[PDB]
Amino acid sequence: TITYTSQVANARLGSFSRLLLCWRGSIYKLLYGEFLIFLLCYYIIRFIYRLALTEEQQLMFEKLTLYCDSYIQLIPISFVLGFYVTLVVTRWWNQYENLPWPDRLMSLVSGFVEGKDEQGRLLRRTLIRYANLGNVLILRSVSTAVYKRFPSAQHLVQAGFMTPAEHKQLEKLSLPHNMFWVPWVWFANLSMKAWLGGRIRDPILLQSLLNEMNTLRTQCGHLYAYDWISIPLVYTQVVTVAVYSFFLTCLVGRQFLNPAKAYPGHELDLVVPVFTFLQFFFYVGWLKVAEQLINPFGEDDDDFETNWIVDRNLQVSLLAVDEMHQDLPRMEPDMYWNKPEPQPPYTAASAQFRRASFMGSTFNISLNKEEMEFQP
Amino acid sequence: TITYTSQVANARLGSFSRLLLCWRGSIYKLLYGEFLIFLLCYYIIRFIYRLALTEEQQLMFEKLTLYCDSYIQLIPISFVLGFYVTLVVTRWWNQYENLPWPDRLMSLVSGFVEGKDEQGRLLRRTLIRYANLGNVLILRSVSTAVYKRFPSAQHLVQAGFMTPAEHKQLEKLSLPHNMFWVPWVWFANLSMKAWLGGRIRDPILLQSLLNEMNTLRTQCGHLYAYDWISIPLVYTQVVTVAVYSFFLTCLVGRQFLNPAKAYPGHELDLVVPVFTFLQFFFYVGWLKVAEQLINPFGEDDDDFETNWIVDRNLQVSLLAVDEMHQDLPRMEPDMYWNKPEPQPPYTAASAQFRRASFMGSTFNISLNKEEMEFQP
Amino acid sequence: TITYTSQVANARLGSFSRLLLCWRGSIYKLLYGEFLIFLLCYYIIRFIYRLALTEEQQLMFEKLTLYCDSYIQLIPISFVLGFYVTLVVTRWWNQYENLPWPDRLMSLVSGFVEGKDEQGRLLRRTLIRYANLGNVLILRSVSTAVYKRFPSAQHLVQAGFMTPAEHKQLEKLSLPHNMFWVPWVWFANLSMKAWLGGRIRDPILLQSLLNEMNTLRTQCGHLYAYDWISIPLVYTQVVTVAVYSFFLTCLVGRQFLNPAKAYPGHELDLVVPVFTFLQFFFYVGWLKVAEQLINPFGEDDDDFETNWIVDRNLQVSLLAVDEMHQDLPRMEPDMYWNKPEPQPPYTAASAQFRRASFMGSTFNISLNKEEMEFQP
Amino acid sequence: TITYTSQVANARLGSFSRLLLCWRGSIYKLLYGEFLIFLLCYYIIRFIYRLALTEEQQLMFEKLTLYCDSYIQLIPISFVLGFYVTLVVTRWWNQYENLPWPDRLMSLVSGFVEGKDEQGRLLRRTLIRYANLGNVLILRSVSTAVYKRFPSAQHLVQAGFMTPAEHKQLEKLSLPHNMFWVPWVWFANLSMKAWLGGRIRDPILLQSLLNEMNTLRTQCGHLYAYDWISIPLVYTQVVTVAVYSFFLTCLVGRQFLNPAKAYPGHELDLVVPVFTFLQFFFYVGWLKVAEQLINPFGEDDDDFETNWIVDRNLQVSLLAVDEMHQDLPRMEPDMYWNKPEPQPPYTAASAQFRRASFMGSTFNISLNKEEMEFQP
Amino acid sequence: TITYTSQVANARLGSFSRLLLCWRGSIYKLLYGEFLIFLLCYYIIRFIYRLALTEEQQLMFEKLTLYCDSYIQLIPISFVLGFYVTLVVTRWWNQYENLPWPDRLMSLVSGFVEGKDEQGRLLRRTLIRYANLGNVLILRSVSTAVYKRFPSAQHLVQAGFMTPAEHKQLEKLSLPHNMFWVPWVWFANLSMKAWLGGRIRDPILLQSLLNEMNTLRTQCGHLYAYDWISIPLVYTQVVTVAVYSFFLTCLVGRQFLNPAKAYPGHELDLVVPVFTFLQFFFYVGWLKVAEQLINPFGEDDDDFETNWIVDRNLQVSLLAVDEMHQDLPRMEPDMYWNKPEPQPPYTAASAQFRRASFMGSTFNISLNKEEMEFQP
Ligand SMILES: [Ca+2]
Ligand SMILES: [Ca+2]
Ligand SMILES: [Ca+2]
Ligand SMILES: [Ca+2]
Ligand SMILES: [Ca+2]
C-alpha cells in the first residue's frame, strides 16, 4: 500500500502534479517494460521503412501508415477501459472491506469472559487465537505474501498461530476442501463450554460473542468468494485486446513519413512521437490500474499489507484479551466535572479552525410579523 | 468458473497478454461461430460486388457504401453496451452473493444443540439437513446443472438429501408453487421442539438459530427472485438490435471500394477489414460477456459451480454438526503465553513484506514550539 | 413478468438473436404503434415533396432536408436515454426488492405461537392474516391490477382477506390517509396479548416476531414511497422531448430527395430508410424500456405479477401457520449416518460437473527449501 | 411532489409524450425565464449583425461565427451533466430515504407500553410525542416550508408539538448547537422510567423500543448531514460554467450567416434556430433537474411534502398509541378456516391477471431415462 | 465545509448563476495559480513565435501547430475525469458517513447507567469520555486540523479529553501501532464492571450499550482504512497525466497563427484564446474537485469541520449523560388529549403548503358495475 494522504490533504498548487515525481507504485514502474518494448518495435519499424524498403515498397508503407492513422479511432478503448476499471476498483474496495478485524470480538471477549486466573486467561487467549487462526487461514489461502510467510500448517504451528494439538485436530477432521471454517466451529463450541462452565455469565453475552464471530466468518467467506470467482476472463480479454490492438496499430499509423511526399499530417518530421507516447502512458496506465487492482492480495506496491495486518491483529487481540481484561485506568472526576459547557482550548496553529455551529439552512430565513401568525 | 487470480496476482509485464492465451471460457470460444458467419457474409458481399455487378451496379454500390459509412456511430452502441453490461455484471455478482452457505448456521447448531447421545446427533443432523435440503431445492429450481443432477424429488431421496418420510410430507403439503420454503418451516418447528425438550438451553440461542435460518431463507428467496424476474426483454432486445444494426451496416460501409475511383477514404484496398474485425471482436465480446453472465447458473465455463457448492456444504455442515460437536483441541498455553509483544517470524521468501505500522497521515506533520501552545 | 432465463442459461450461437423472435413484452409490441405513425408521417412527407412542390418549393424542401440531416447530431439523445434508463432500472429493481414476503414471519409464527387447539389455530391464522392484509392493502394502493381485483374494502372482505369485524374497525379508525399501516399495529397488539396469555413463551420470541413484522412494514412503506415520489417530471420530459424531436427531425432529414439534384447521399432513392428505421427501433425501444419499467405495478407484460404474489403468499402463509405447525416428518438417521465424507451420486447428465474443490489461488505456488525456512 | 405513476402505469402509445402537456413541476415552468433571456440576447445579436455592422464588420462577424461554431462541443458538457445529475439524484433519493417515519416505533410503543388508564395513556402519548418532536425539530431545521410553518419554538408549543414544560426544559438545556437530539435522550430516559415502574414488562421490549428510537435518530442525523454538507461548490460551479459557456458561445456560433456567402454551414437561414433552442431545452432542463433536486426540502413543485408528512405522522402515531392500544377486531375463524388451498376470486376486470406459478427456469428441461440414472 | 443549501433551496432564475459570485471554496480560489501559470506560458510561447522566430522557424511552428491541434481529443479526458471524480466523491461521502457521533450511545448510557449519586455520575461521564477519547484519537490520526489542535497525548490530557491516569495507562499499553482501539476495550470492561456492580440492571442493556460502542468502533476503523488505503497512485497519476498532457498540447495547438497565411481555421487572430481558457477552467476545475475531496480531512474550504464536530460531540455527550439523566419535563396531557384527529395550525407563510393526503396511484381508477363484480 502506497499512502499519499498527507501529501494530498490540501488542494494546493500542483498538488497532483507533485505526485508525478513518485516511483513506488507509479505508472512508470508499472509500464516501463511495455513502453520499452513499444519503443523498440516503433523505431525498428521506422528504420525498416526508411532504409530497407525500396521506392515502391516505401510508397505502399506510406499508404498503409495513412490508412492505419485514419482507421485508429474505431477502437473504443476508452469506453471499455472506463467501465472495466470501475468494476475492478469496486471489487478492490469490496475486497478490502471484507478484511476481518478482530477488534469488536476482542473487546467483547475481554469484557464477557470472566476470570483473572490462569483458566480465564487461557480461555480468552484461546478464543482470540481461534479468531486469528481462522483469519490467517483465509489470508494464506487468498494472499501470495501470506502464503510465502506460512507455506504450510507446520509453518503456522511454528509461528504460534496454531498449537500442535490444533494441527493434529485439523488433520483428523481433514476433508477435501479448504479448512478455514474449522476455527469458527471451534470458537462456537468453546464459547458454549465457557458459558456452561460459568465463565460467561449470560446467554445474551454468549450470543453477542457468536454474532461477532459470525460477522468475521462472513467476511472471510467473502474473501474466499472474491479469490475464487474472478472477473470474467472474456471481459478481461476484451479490454486487453482493445488496448494492445490500439497500440499495435499505432506502431504503423504513427510513423513519421518522408517529408518529400508532404502528406497533410506528415509535413514536419521529428523522431520522437510525443503524443503517441502520451497516449501510450494514458491508456496503458489505465490498463495497469486494473492489472494491479484485479488481485489486491499479490505483491504489488499498492496491494494490501496482509502480513502487517496479521501481525497487528495478533498483537492487539492478544493484548486486549489478556492484559487489558478488567484492567482499567483509575476512575476520577474529569476536567469539566462542574462545567456546564466544556470548551477545550485551541492551539495557535488551530485557532483558525474554531467555527460556529451550523444550525440549519433555514436558520436565516426572515419573515414578517403577519407572515408568522397562525391562522384559524 | 474459471480462476486466474494466481496468474493476475502481480501486475507483471504483459499479465493480460498472457491471459490472452487461455481457451476455456474465452472470447474465442464464445464468438468463433458468429465471427465465421460475419466473415462469410462480408466476403460473399465482396465477391458479389467485384465479380457480378456491372459498371452501373458497381457505381451505385460505391455510392451506397460511402452513404452508409457516415451513419456508423460508436457512441450510442458503446453507451448501450456499457450500461447493459454493467447491469448484467451487478446482477451476476448479487446472484453469487445470494448463494446460501450453511457455515454460520452450522456453527450455531453445533454449539447450541446439546447432547452427545444418539438423540442429540439426530437432532443436529436433521436441522443441518433441513437447511441443506432447502438450499438444494432452490438450487435445483434455478440451476440447470443441479437440475440435471437431481431431476426429481425421488432423485433427491436417492442422493440422501431427503428421507422418504420428508418426501411423503412434501407430497402431502404439495401446493401449486415451488415448495423450496417448506424446509425452513420444518427447521423452525424442530428448533422450537428442541428448545421445549431441553436440547436448546435458552430462547436467546433459539432466536440466534432462527435468525441464521431466516438469513439463509432470504438468500434463497433472492435466488428465486433473480431466476424469475429476468432483465427486461425489451432492454435485451434493444442492446441486441443496436449491435446487429451496427454490424449489418458495417457489412457494406466497410467494404473496400475500387481504389481507381479515388474515393476519399478508400485509397488502400486490403482484402481483410482489420479494424472492422477488431470492432466486431470488441463489441461482440462485450455482448458475449452479458450473454454468459445473464444466467450465471447455466453450464457455461464461467458459470457457478453449484454442484460443488452443494457437495461441499453437505459435507462441511454434517461434519461440523456431528463430529465437531463438543470436540475441541486441548486448550493449552500458546507460544506467546507471557510475551507482551508477539512477533511471528518471517521466512526468507517473505522477509521483504515486513512493514512498519502506518500511524496516520498527520503523524509526520511538523510544528514549532509556539504553534503547539494552547491559547486561553 | 416475461421469463427467458432457461433460454439464456448458456451462451450459445445467436443466444440473444433467438430472443428477437419473441412477441409478448417485446420491442415490437411496445413500439409498433409509434413506428406506424412515424412511417405514415414519413411517407406522407415524401409524397408531398414529390407531388406537391412546384420546383422552387422542391428546391427549398431539398435545402431544408440538407440542414435537418446535418443538425440532427445536436441532440444528446444517447446520453439522456442512457442516464435516465439506468435510474429507471435501478428504481424498478428496488421496487421489486421491497415486495413483502411473509416467509420469515410465517415460519416464526408457526414455531413460536403455541397451541394445537382451536384458539392456537385462530391466533396463528389471525397473525398471518394481519400480515397478508397489510401487504394486500399496500399492493392495492400501488398496483393497478391489484386495485382492479379489489376495488374496495368490501371486495377485500368478500375475498377473505379481511373480516367484517376488521372492516368495521377500519371504518371506525378511518383517517384522511392511506390506512395500510393499521394491520401492523393490530399485529403488535395481538402478539402482546398472545404473550400475556401464555401462547408465546418468551419476550425474546415476541421481539423476533415483531422484528419480522417491522421489516415487512418497512418494505410496504418503501413501496408506498416509490408509488408517491415519482421520478422528476422535468427529468422525464427532457428525455421524452429529446427522443421525439430527434425522430420528428428525421421525418424531413431522412427523405430521399430527387436524384437529379445529385445531392451527396441523396443520389440513390432507396424509398425505404432502413437505417432510419433501425435507429427508430433502437432509440424508441431504449425509451420504451423506461416507459414500461417506470411503474412496475401496472399491466405491462414485464410488470410484476402482484396478483399471483398475493395469492401465493396467502396460501403459503396459511398452510405454514396452520397445517405445518408442530407437524414434522419422522426423525430418523439419514443415508450418511456413519459416513465421515458423504458423496451424493451424479447422474449421467451431470457426471461432467464433478469438480475438484478450489483450495485458493496460492495453492499451487512453489517455493524452495531455503525460501520456506524461517529466519531469526 | 408531482405524481404521475397512474399516468405512466402502462407503456401505452405516447405514454411519455402525454406528459409534455403538464405545467406544474415542468421543464417549461423551470426554464422559461432563462429561455426568454437567451432569446432576447440571440435576437439582439442577430439584429446588430445584419443592421449595425458595416460591410467588413459583417465579414469579421462571419469569421467569428465560424470560429465559435467550431468550438461548440456536446460530449464534455454531456458527460459532466450526466455525472453531476446522477450524483444529485442519488443524494435526493437518499435524503428521502432518511425521512423519519414513526410507524415501527408507534407499533412497538402501542404493544409494549401497558396500561389502559390515564397514566398509561399519558406515557404512550408522551413517548410518541417525543419521537414526533425530534422529527419536527430536524424537519424545521432542514426544510424551508417547515420553518415557515414553525418559525420558533413558541410556534411549536402553540401547534401542540411541544408542551410549555418541554419548552422550558429545552431553554434550560440550551447549548450553542442545534438541539434536535434532546427528544431522543428524553425518550430513552422516559422508557427506562416506564420499565422501572412496571409499565414496560421486559428489558427486551425496552431494548426494541430504544432500537427503533435510535434508528429514527440515525435518520434525523442523516437529514442534518445532508443539509449541512452540501455538494462541493467547486463541482457545482464547474457544471454551471460548462453549461453557461456552451450557451454563451452558441449566442454567436449559431447565428444565421448570409446564405449568399455560400458558407458550408449556412445555405438556408430560418431566423429561428430550432436546433439551438432544442439543445438549450435539453441541456438547461438537465441542469434544472439538479437545480431543483439539490435541495429537496425547498418549495419547488417536486420537493418533498414535509408539512403533510409531519401532520400525517403526528395523527397516525397518536391514534396508534392511544386509541388502538389493546383495541383489536374480534378474533374469529376466517373464510378459509378449513380450506386446504384458499383461492380468492377474481373480478371481470382482473380475471386476465390469473397466472400459473413459476416453478423455476429448469422446470421444462427434458432428460432421457439413461441420462437421469445415477452412476456408481 | 461551505454550505449553500439555503441558497439552492428553490430552483429559481439563475439559481446556480448566483453561485458563481462566491470566493470561498470556489473554482477561482482553487485554480487561479494554475490558470496564471498556463496563461504566462501560452503568452511566452506566442511572443517567442511572433517576435523571435525567423521565417522558416515560424513556418515550422505553424505546421507543428496544426499537428498538435490534430492530436487533441476530449472524449478520453472527459471519460477518465468523470469516473475518477465519481470515485473520489463516493469515497468522500463514505468518509463523512464514517464520522462517529455519540448520540445513540449517549442516549443509551443516560438511560441505562443508573444512579444520581457521584459514583453514577462518574460512571456515565467516564463511559461517554471513553467513547469521545476513541473518536478524538482516530480524528487526530486522520485529520490535519485535529492533529494541529492536539499534536500530542499531553495536549489531549491538557485539553481534558484524557486524564493523567488514562495517559499513563496508554503509555503502559503502548504498542508499535495506532492505539486508537484502546478506549473501546476500556469501555467494554467498564460496562462489564458496571453491570456486575448493579449499575446496569440487565445484560440486555449491557448488550445494547456494547452494540452502540462497537458501531462507533467500526466507524473509526473505516476512517482509519480510508486514511491508510489511498486511491491507487497509478490511477491518480493517470488522471493527472491525461489533464496535463491535454493542456500541454493545447499550449502549442491553440496558438493563433499569422492570419496572412490563411490557414484552414486561423483566419481570426484574437489575442485571447477564450475557448481554450474556458476548457482550462472546466477540466482543471473538474480535477480540482477530486484534488480537494481526495483527503476530506485537510484544511480546504470544503473539508469537514472535524474540530467543531469534536467540540460538539464532547459537549452534547457530557450534557446528555450527566444533566439529562432521569431529568425529564413534567408529563402532562397534550393539546390533543381527547382530539381524535389533531390538526396543527398553519401560519400565513405556510398556508399554501397544506396538502391532501396521497392515497396511492390507483385511487382515481374508474371501473364499471360489471367490471368490479367477482367471477365464479
Ligand atoms: Ca495485484
Ligand atoms: Ca450462463
Ligand atoms: Ca409498467
Ligand atoms: Ca428544491
Ligand atoms: Ca482536502
Swiss-Prot record, chains A, B, C, D, E:
Lipid bilayer topology: Multi-pass membrane protein
GO-annotated cellular components: basal plasma membrane; basolateral plasma membrane; chloride channel complex; cytosol; membrane; membrane microdomain; plasma membrane; presynapse
GO biological-process terms attached to the record: chloride transport; detection of light stimulus involved in visual perception; gamma-aminobutyric acid secretion, neurotransmission; glutamate secretion; monoatomic ion transmembrane transport; protein complex oligomerization; regulation of calcium ion transport; regulation of synaptic plasticity
Tissues in which the protein is found: Predominantly expressed in the basolateral membrane of the retinal pigment epithelium.
Reactions this protein catalyses: chloride(in) = chloride(out); hydrogencarbonate(in) = hydrogencarbonate(out); 4-aminobutanoate(in) = 4-aminobutanoate(out); L-glutamate(out) = L-glutamate(in)
UniProt keyword annotation of Transport present: yes
Activity regulation (UniProt): Inactivated by sulfhydryl-reactive agents.
Effect ascribed to mutating residue 104 to C: In age-related macular degeneration
Location(s) in or outside the cell: Cell membrane; Basolateral cell membrane
Keywords: Calcium, Cell membrane, Chloride, Chloride channel, Disease variant, Ion channel, Ion transport, Membrane, Phosphoprotein, Retinitis pigmentosa, Sensory transduction, Transmembrane, Transmembrane helix, Transport, Vision
Effect of residue 139 to R: In VMD2; abolishes membrane insertion
Principal place of residence: membrane
One Gene Ontology MF term: ligand-gated channel activity
Keyword Cell inner membrane listed: no
Subunit annotation: Interacts with YWHAG; this interaction promotes the ligand-gated L-glutamate channel activity leading to the positive regulation of NMDA glutamate receptor activity through the L-glutamate secretion.
Known role: Ligand-gated anion channel that allows the movement of anions across cell membranes when activated by calcium (Ca2+). Allows the movement of chloride and hydrogencarbonate. Found in a partially open conformation leading to significantly smaller chloride movement. Upon F2R/PAR-1 activation, the sequestered calcium is released into the cytosol of astrocytes, leading to the (Ca2+)-dependent release of L-glutamate into the synaptic cleft that targets the neuronal postsynaptic GRIN2A/NMDAR receptor resulting in the synaptic plasticity regulation.
Protein name (Swiss-Prot/TrEMBL): Bestrophin-1
Native species: Homo sapiens
Gene name of this polypeptide: BEST1
Portion of the full-length sequence here: 2 to 377 of 585
